[PDB]
Amino acid sequence: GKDLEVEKALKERMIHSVMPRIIADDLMKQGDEESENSVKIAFRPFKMQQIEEVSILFADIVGFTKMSANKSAHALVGLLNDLFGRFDRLCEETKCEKISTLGDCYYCVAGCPEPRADHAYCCIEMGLGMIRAIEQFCQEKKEMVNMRVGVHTGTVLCGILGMRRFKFDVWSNDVNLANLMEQLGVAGKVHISEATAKYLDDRYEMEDGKVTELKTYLIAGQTKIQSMRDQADWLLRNIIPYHVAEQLKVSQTYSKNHDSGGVIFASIVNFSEFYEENYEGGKECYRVLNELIGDFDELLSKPDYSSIEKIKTIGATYMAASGLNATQCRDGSHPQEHLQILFEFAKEMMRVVDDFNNNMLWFNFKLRVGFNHGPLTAGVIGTTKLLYDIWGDTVNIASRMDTTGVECRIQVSEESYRVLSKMGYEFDYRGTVNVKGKGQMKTYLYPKCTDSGLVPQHQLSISPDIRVQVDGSIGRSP
Amino acid sequence: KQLQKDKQVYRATHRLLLLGAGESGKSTIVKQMRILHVKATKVQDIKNNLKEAIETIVAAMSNLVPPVELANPENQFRVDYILSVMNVPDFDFPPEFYEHAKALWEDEGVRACYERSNEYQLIDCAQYFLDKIDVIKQDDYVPSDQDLLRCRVLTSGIFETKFQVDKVNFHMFDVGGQRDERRKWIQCFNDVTAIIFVVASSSYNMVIREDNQTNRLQEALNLFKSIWNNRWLRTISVILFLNKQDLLAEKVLAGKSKIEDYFPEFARYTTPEDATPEPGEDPRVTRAKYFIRDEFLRISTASGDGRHYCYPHFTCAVDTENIRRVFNDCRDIIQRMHLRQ
Ligand SMILES: Nc1nc2c(ncn2[C@@H]2O[C@H](COP(=O)(O)OP(=O)(O)OP(O)(O)=S)[C@@H](O)[C@H]2O)c(=O)[nH]1
Ligand SMILES: [Mg+2]
């Protein structure tokens, strides 16, 4: 009776926490019944719209590792709630839709669902507001941080891909360019290009933004209820896991400090050479990428990958972590058996991309994954929104193992080698890779001699780690 | 709301994806559809086809394993003129080039090199265009419809053509079929009505341009087995055009090339009892074309579970009347196939 509209309010709050307001109210007039039959044969359904004249901001906290050093993993999550709540208040001031928030990186768009005639102004003024808010946060909380901002305009095809942990994102080459101009930026200034400056109309303090190492500038200022209940329960188990939902049932916020949890990233390498925008924006290419992400998500419904959590997918990357739910060490279970089953998850998603390429004719997707375990930090960011995410040095080293890997092979760090080798798996010594904070680090690869006669390559000591596409490394290694 | 009308007329159309290997006749079928149901760059790339054909024959003279020599050995300066212009971006086509090309094509060692054209990659409009640019050595001639059908331009990318037969909307996807272009095919697999698969039937003795070690018709068989057993096409029927029937006819009536030397099961093959041959047709040609049809129907019969079908037709893309007949038949077929949802 009245608990039906209670469940409808909860379902409303879980729709709005993952989708923008226009698309959420479109979903709340129950527009497509086939999507409403999907919440209940050739391609899986997906919704994307190739939208022009947007403005994409990224923004990354500079100096996040030392700022999160001596924290008790509740103080960290609390101050991070404070900073990101200030950013959300800036978003709802400046009329820029935020997209998501991964790690120490926050990123927005400027009027992709609704066309806005001054989207570039909204985007760079929101970046200047971020610089102001982070210096006020540094003064108040006494934490020595600032942030660099990059803004690019262009066309963007935006929507939802995947069906576990799905979320409204954006994808284009313009998003990759906004990412790299965040990466090429200086802290404290918003880093804009010619694509923004051609209609920025120069009412700001522009500079020739030159690199130290392409018409780029710098600005510094101036029984129905059973259906509704199961539907809202699926939307809740969508956006956060179960144990965090139980701990958040009796409290106001969530923050947890795990001492041993594994984590994989999984980047599809050659999706760039499949992408080309020559047909209708390339949304058919993202339909194909949706099919592969949905196959990975169908791996999660297996009865033996119940305790594998999926954090999110970042472009073509796929982040998953384990050992978060296993609070009780059983009587007849190995203490690091979650590492064994997350490694089996990585092996089986290798198998899934092998089975996927049989239906792909005269092209092969390849993915590299990277594996690590250790202590980490779980938490929930928003209130009136929700965002489950993990942090730690372990996640940064796993992103490093993804980025510094060879394709079609599982790269495994040294302590993960030392625990996996006692469970019978065979590895071969890849070499020694520079890891920030660790220095030169001993790495390993999983398939024994899957190349003909070249297992070792230990010469890699590259300092310039600049990624030209959206990967799992964003929000990692400030 | 204006999107319900557009959504329903999008439901009303027929998406006709054209697949197949390279040089099989897809773009010629698209050109034939716009002849049936719908200006100097055509002259230019017809001249490019002429130049490409004559230089390919002239180079393949020496590049054969017995080098076929000139029947008149006095044209060696003309051979050297053709080999001199073998690689140049722009070419104004002077009348000297037309005289050298005609004096090549009158020579009979040149034609004896032309007859062994399955041992090197040569285009399927040489014999027509050598005579027809003997016709248009001058400049004030507009090409005919057959001249436009015979021109070969390599398709790369997804091309679309909307035409409307008797108040029914058609929207067909011309795609390139070279091996590096095939990754672009899956962009068209969503909500397509039928697949028109086009096979160069007469290319049983030829090899593909990519590696020069794989038979063209074996490549088409492997490609058909790929797109038939696909996970996103497993409810979509495949109309199977078998193109280039006149070329298959003249290559069987020539008697030089033997299908049993390349596909060895042809010698113990008998023509089917339900064969419907054309008026006045040599049954060795009929045995050949039904052999190729049953080679593809073996693939379409071995799996498919009754979810999707295969409807083989015999067709010649440069003949407009043949395309009118087979497209009326396919029009009734895809009317049924669109009603099948
Ligand atoms: N004699 C004859 N020639 C044909 C026939 N169909 C096509 N051709 C010739 O084959 C050549 C190539 O045909 P084309 O239509 O370009 O194949 P395609 O599929 O588009 O080639 P691609 O796009 O995969 S590279 C053209 O020169 C054309 O004249 C036919 O039915 N009979
Ligand atoms: Mg073509």
Chain-centroid distance of CA A333 in Å reads 32
Q: What is the distance between the alpha carbons of residues A56 and A109, in angstroms, rounded to a whole number?
A: 5
The candidate with the shortest Cα–Cα distance to A186, out of A163, A166, A215, A210, is: A210
Measured from the alpha carbon of residue B206, the closest ligand is 1
Q: Report CB contact under 8 Å: B183, A284.
A: no
Q: Give the CATH H-level superfamily of domain B1-38+155-341.
A: P-loop containing nucleotide triphosphate hydrolases (3.40.50.300)
Please name the member of A41, A42, A279 whose beta carbon is closest to the beta carbon of B187. A279
Within the 213-232 window of chain B, which residues sit less than 8 Å (CB to CB) from chain A?
Answer: 223, 226-227, 230-232
Give me the residue spans of the domains in chain B.
Answer: 1-38+155-341, 39-154
Cβ distance A264 to A300 under 8 Å? no
Question: What approach was used to elucidate this structure?
Answer: cryo-EM
Least Cα distance to B33 among B159, B134, B204 occurs for: B159
**Looking at the DSSP assignment, which residues form a beta bridge with residue A314?**
A317
Chain B residues with CB under 8 Å of A43 CB are 189-190, 232
Which residue from B144, B142, B242 is spatially nearest to B202, judged by alpha carbons?
A: B242
Cα of A295 vs centre of ligand 1, distance in Å, is: 39
Q: How far is CA B193 from the centre of its chain?
A: 22
What is the rounded distance in angstroms from the CA atom of residue B104 to the CA atom of residue B126?
13
Distance in Å, CA B25 to ligand 2 centroid: 7
State if residue B320 touches ligand 1 by the CB under 6 angstroms criterion: no
Buried b / exposed e along B144-164 (16+ C-beta atoms within 10 A): eeebebbbbeebeebeebeee
CA distance A392 to A259: 11
- The DSSP letter of residue B74 is G
∠ CA A294-A300-A302 to the nearest 5 degrees?
120
Give this entry's resolution in angstroms. 3.1
Half-sphere exposure of A211 (CA within 13 A, CB side): 12
Q: Is B280 left (phi over 0), alpha (psi -120 to 50) or beta?
A: left
Please indicate whether residue B219 is annotated as part of the active site.
Answer: no
Q: What is the dihedral of CA A270, A276, A282, A288, to 10 degrees?
A: -30
| End-to-end Cα spacing for chain A | 51
Angle (CA) B52-B55-B56 rounded to 5° is 80
Q: Indicate the top mutation candidate among B122, B123, B318 to test ligand 1's pocket, ranked by most ligand atoms within 8 A of CB.
A: B318
SS3 assignment for chain A: CHHHHHHHHHHHHHHHCCCCHHHHHHHHCCCCHHHHHHHCCCCCCCCEEEEEEEEEEEEEEECHHHHCCCCCCCHHHHHHHHHHHHHHHHHHHHCCEEEEEECCEEEEECCCCCCCCCHHHHHHHHHHHHHHHHHHHHHHHCCCCEEEEEEEEEEEEEECCCCCCCCCEEECHHHHHHHHHHHCCCCCCEEECHHHHCCCCCCCCEEECCCCCCCCEEECCCCHHHHHHHHHHHHHHHHCCHHHHHHHHCCCCCEEEECCCCEEEEEEHHHHHHCCCCCCCCHHHHHHHHHHHHHHHHHHHCCCCCCEEEEEEECCEEEEEECCCCCCCCCCCCCCHHHHHHHHHHHHHHHHHHHHCCCCCCCCCCEEEEEECCCEEEEECCCCCCCEEEECHHHHHHHHHHHCCCCCCEEECHHHHHHHHHHCCCCEEEEEEEECCCEEEEEEECCCCCCCCCCCCCCCCCCCCCCCCCCCCCCCCC
Half-sphere exposure of B191 (CA within 13 A, CB side): 11
* Residue B102 burial (CB count, 10 A): 17
Q: Which residues contact B130 (CB under 8 A, 6 or more apart)?
A: B50, B53, B54, B101, B105
Chain center to CA of A286: 17
Q: Exposed, middle or buried: residue A331 (CB in 10 Å: 0-12, 13-18, 19+)?
A: exposed
Q: For domain B39-154, give the CATH superfamily.
A: GI Alpha 1, domain 2-like (1.10.400.10)
